[PDB]
Amino acid sequence: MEMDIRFRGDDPEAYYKALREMIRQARKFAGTVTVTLIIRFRGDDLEALEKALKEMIRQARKFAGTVTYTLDGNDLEIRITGVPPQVILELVKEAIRLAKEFNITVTVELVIRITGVPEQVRKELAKEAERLAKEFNITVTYTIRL
């Protein structure tokens, strides 16, 4: 009685707005939407990475959630939990922005943990996940439990 959705290496506005609408629909529908966000930064400019950490910590710590991280030399991992789903989309836009500003390499991943929803919702979101994967040519997967 649960559906997860996993997205990675996201594309420009057309995709973000579309995704947002799926995000929106899901929240409305009679269920619990638990979202988790992961980003990994890479680059030799360690000073840049340390600030990219600090901006995302401060912004995302203003939500009723928490933040964890690790630095495997020149690879910084960030795991954000507890954030409202309609904002999540915008924290994605901010972490891409930091990739450009500091001229560093960044990857992004969204985990949506939907609990107790209709099979009509599951099939539509599936079709929307099937659709977006193909139009934008990116990493898209999902899981359903019963």
Author numbering: 1 to 146
Mind quoting what the paper says about this structure?
Here, we explore the viability of such a mechanism by inserting one de novo designed alpha beta protein into another such that the two beta sheets are combined into one. Crystal structures of two such proteins demonstrate that complex beta sheet structures can be designed with considerable accuracy using this approach and provide a proof-of-concept for the hypothesis that complex beta topologies in natural proteins may have evolved from simpler beta sheet structures in a similar manner.
CD spectra show that the protein contains both alpha and beta structures. However, unbiased low-resolution omit maps suggest that the overall topology is correct. In the model that displays the best refinement statistics, the protein backbone was similar to the design model with a C-alpha RMSD value of 2 Å. The fused beta sheet aligns with the design model, while the inter-domain helices shift slightly to accommodate the inter-domain interface.
